[PDB]
Design a protein around this ligand. Structure first.
Ligand SMILES: *[C@@H]1O[C@H](CO)[C@@H](O)[C@H](O)[C@H]1NC(C)=O
Length: 112
């Protein structure tokens, strides 16, 4: 059961990944995109490298990430949604070599 997010193309879309603020305390977060089914997942952007500053927005081009570590809500903004921006993404909580999956989403688009 993934979840879906619909966006009008040319205007911005926000996705929210809720999580347990305590379970993932001190953990960096990342937003990545999927290719085909089984893999790979490729990192688009991660929250600030210093956890106390993860409330700072981070950008990879048109994609922004911000983390509310106290309330436990990660928020990704796809500014100016595009057709090619559509696809299957996930939010990740990182620890050591591994990453755990916080939420799994599709993005949809409509022109005009
Ligand atoms: C930023 O650009 C795209 C995100 O869509 C990705 O392929 C690339 O690896 C990103 N850069 C880094 C350093 O993660």
């Amino acid at each position: 059961n993934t979840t879906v997010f619909q966006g009008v193309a040319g205007q911005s879309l926000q996705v929210s990944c809720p999580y347990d603020s305590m379970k993932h305390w001190g953990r960096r977060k990342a937003w990545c995109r999927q290719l085909g089914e089984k893999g790979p997942c490729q990192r688009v952007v991660s929250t600030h490298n210093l956890w106390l500053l993860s409330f700072l927005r981070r950008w990879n081009g048109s994609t922004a990430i911000t983390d509310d570590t106290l309330g436990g809500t990660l928020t990704i903004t796809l500014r100016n949604l595009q057709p090619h921006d559509a696809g299957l993404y996930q939010c990740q909580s990182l620890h050591g070599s591994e990453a755990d999956t916080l939420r799994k989403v599709l993005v949809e688009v409509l022109a005009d």
